[PDB]
């Protein structure tokens with residue numbers, strides 16, 4: 001009836017695939033490169049680099065920081081994160097030996113709690129990795145006040161908020177790097193795909209290098225990694241300079257991404273209209289609280305949190321929902337801190353408490369928002385959730 | 387041109403791509419699952435796990451060893467590798483904090499020098515990662531003799547030797563794990579693609595988990611990682627237990643992969659016919675040494691090494707081969723140890739020396755072999771390399 005996922009494609013995505021077939025160049029090329037230019041232009045960054053998925057976009061984002069001429073991050077370094085996000089926002093911190101400090105979320109915005117942030121910040125903090133949750137941007141104004149010129153890097157996992165903006169700027173472009181995802185279920189889809197954006201050329205060349213074999217084949221003759229490239233191909237083409245990966249996207253995802261980006265503004269427009277109608281139907285709801293928007297959210301989906309002491313039990317709504325053909329799931333993955341089994345591999349600490357994440361973990365659920373008009377579905381959802 | 391790589395595709399892989407487009411299901415699924423099954427069966431391994439590339443296959447191979455119930459490896463352990471190979475054979479080792487011990491290669495076979503190895507193996511050696519170079523398998527009988535019952539893990543990077551055999555056993559299936567690549571220029575091509583095979587179910591379950599977010603979704607109800615999966619999918623489907631990645635292959639790659647396996651034997655045969663031909667044409671070549679075969683090479687390509695005391699300058703030969711429109715390159719990456727820049731990041735040492743690797747690095751070169759008859763390129767090559 002009402003799924004969490006619908007297809008974003010049309011004839012056009014298919015044609016783009018044909019175009020690629022007909023070219024007989026399958027691995028990362030023209031399209032991918034064209035696609036990166038469009039992406040950057042699209043969100044207002046100087047550079048964009050396409051990878052195999054948003055997870056690997058997070059991996060290189062952290063990785064790159066260790067290979068700047070003046071390494072910006074080091075093993076043991078303290079990084080702050082919020083307690084609610086996708087797993088692969090965290091894994092990379094572990095794989096790089098960072099010390100992780102979790103902070104609770106604000107139960108209204110579902111983003112990192114600001115007042116906890118303020119106090120959680122110190123002289124030991126090297127970086128802050130924010131996540132724009134469910135399409136909702138962090139209030140970067142306040143985040144910038146809290147950092148206050150200190151050597152603390154700001155990073156964004158924007159895998160759920162493509163299109164969101166805050167004060168006339170695209171989410172994802174506030175940090176030194178911002179990551180995106182074009183996985184099937186996201187604002188657009190290239191089957192799998194992710195992207196890192198940055199206005200830093202140094203970081204930009206490093207990303208080009210660790211994305212594919214740690215080589216220099218995709219570096220420009222004069223570049224910020226090696227500096228000046230020899231002209232002996234026999235030579236230059238087989239020099240390895242950073243311990244990277246092969247996380248190249250396929251040409252086909254680049255081509256398909258070109259088509260989706262064209263459609264994006266409409267997708268976002270439809271999404272917001274549905275959000276507007278949704279909020280109208282659900283405000284002053286007797287036992288559910290909705291997400292409070294910051295800036296202009298790209299409304300990835302619709303979260304609900306059971307009102308305190310309303311005596312409503314999640315299992316029930318859950319049943320209700322499914323019995324009406326409406327799919328739902330926890331919000332993102334609930335409180336990450338409960339995954340104690342993977343947590344045993346981390347060097348981590350919890351600032352103050354994560355009561356909010358905890359409450360969410362037991363009392364929130366989520367239903368999708370899509371790029372097609374869902375007025376009908378919402379009216380029904382509201383009939384079911386009364 | 388006498389290109390280094392060729393299309394192994396015909397209307398079939400084109401048809402398979404079609405079928406997946408027809409299914410409208412693009413994310414890792416049944417084709418991939420089907421391919422994994424065909425793959426293990428083809429190479430004679432109990433299990434196979436398909437990943438986004440041979441490089442991420444090597445990464446997961448190392449990563450798995452850390453998450454076994456009783457860790458097979460730990461930070462600081464020593465692992466012995468050969469000095470000639472693709473850079474992604476080495477990175478995982480640095481990324482996981484292993485102590486890398488380089489060993490010289492045998493100048494004839496181009497694989498690890500067996501004498502050096504016996505000597506390089508010590509009480510501290512926990513594992514040995516072999517690479518089967520250019521289609522040619524390592525003498526695993528000699529290798530197993532060296533290990534002789536001790537607790538030393540044998541691994542293989544088989545990304546260049548899909549289809550080689552040794553004692554009628556398939557290469558890639560001697561070590562606790564073996565990696566494969568199905569990248570454009572390799573034996574089979576699924577655009578990008580890699581696989582890991584193993585006979586160990588626990589490692590096998592660990593791979594299924596770390597390939598996709600460290601979740602439990604692709605583990606069987608009763609499994610070696612978590613035991614028994616819960617029935618409440620609301621919880622079970624968002625449980626994270628090991629620090630993995632998103633290195634899932636594409637369904638299209640799974641589908642193209644299945645047609646490729648069907649054609650393998652033929653590829654191998656032709657490639658081997660080409661090689662024989664090349665052999666006697668180059669049999670008594672006055673100034674160039676050719677690669678010594680162990681078992682049945684899959685002849686990924688043909689190496690040439692300017693004889694000791696010949697007065698021949700590598701430069702000419704290339705000049706020469708380039709003027710003739712024959713595509714040429716270094717043997718893999720040459721002496722990997724020449725990359726001092728990336729070496730800065732490793733915790734490593736060198737066994738004795740790697741003079742063979744350096745000789746090859748300065749006097750070695752290589753042209754590609756294909757699955758179409760090339761007697762004519764050959765005759766021509768011979769003529770050019772007089």
Ligand SMILES: *[C@H](N[C@@H](CCC(=O)O)C(=O)O)c1c(COP(=O)(O)O)cnc(C)c1O
Pocket residue numbers: 053054055056058085086088089131157158159160181182183185192193194332632
């Ligand atoms: C996307 N999270 C998805 C995971 C879907 C999947 O199987 O990949 C979800 O179900 O919520 C996401 C990522 C991962 O990007 P990727 O899916 O392209 O690997 C990273 N960060 C965030 C915050 C995120 O939502």
Ligand SMILES: *[C@H](N[C@@H](CCC(=O)O)C(=O)O)c1c(COP(=O)(O)O)cnc(C)c1O
Pocket residue numbers: 246439440441442471472474475517543544545546566567568569571579580718
């Ligand atoms: C194959 N190496 C290829 C590299 C092709 C590429 O650019 O990806 C070559 O040109 O020699 C290879 C790999 C890399 O696996 P992948 O290419 O599927 O990521 C890893 N190990 C070895 C030994 C290898 O030959």
